[PDB]
Amino acid sequence: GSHSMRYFFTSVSRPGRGEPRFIAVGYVDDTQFVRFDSDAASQRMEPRAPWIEQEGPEYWDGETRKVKAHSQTHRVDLGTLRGYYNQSEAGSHTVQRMYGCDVGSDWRFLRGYHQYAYDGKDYIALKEDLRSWTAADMAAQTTKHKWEAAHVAEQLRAYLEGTCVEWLRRYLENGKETLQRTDAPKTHMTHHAVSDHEATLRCWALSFYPAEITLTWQRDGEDQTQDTELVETRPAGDGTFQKWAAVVVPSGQEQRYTCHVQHEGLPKPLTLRWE
């Protein structure tokens, strides 16, 4: 299918109780493979998938050096964002950065991004051309006009449209049993008596990869969303994901309903029905 690589960075100020908690995690599709925690003893960039271990020490040396750069950059942007917004040293704020690239079935470049938020709000983002910037507000304008005058989108575009794509591929070849497997959802249905007159059907997807799934309920062929309850797609912690939808139905009417399951490891959609 398509694939993506995406680095997520989280910096959190403890005003005068040390220096900001900085956390960085890299991901190929929905597999994390690297992390860095400021409060970690190692102060290294660190493997969290087997395939990446096989890379040599210069890959590890340099990744440590670069990620310590993102940290200091976050560490400064907090102090600068306090000014722009005229906030008070007596208060913990958060900055978040997210950037990566997607490749198609062919693994050619598809799209890149470079997002940035202050205190859980959109601040500045590379638009899709990767030759301009979206501001959230007037602070951003100032930042965008520093990034216009220093040619930042061009520099970014060179990473995302080049090196992101070349390394994502590399990783994809090296983790071929992990990253390039399509583990199909293993499905079943279950039944609970909620009350006298009514019952719940729950429709399960388990042990699937990647996370992207669509779990759909029908009644006589017509999509029913009213009187359902979808959970968000969660992990089992073995790099497989899970999910269920349910409906409350009238007692006896249960023959009529059907849950419908679409995932890329399923050669054709699955239907389940009660009885």
Binding site: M45, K66, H70, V76, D77, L81, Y123, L156
Partner: peptide
Amino acid sequence: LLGWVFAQV
């Protein structure tokens, strides 16, 4: 591979 463009608000 992490990017390498360090530029600040």
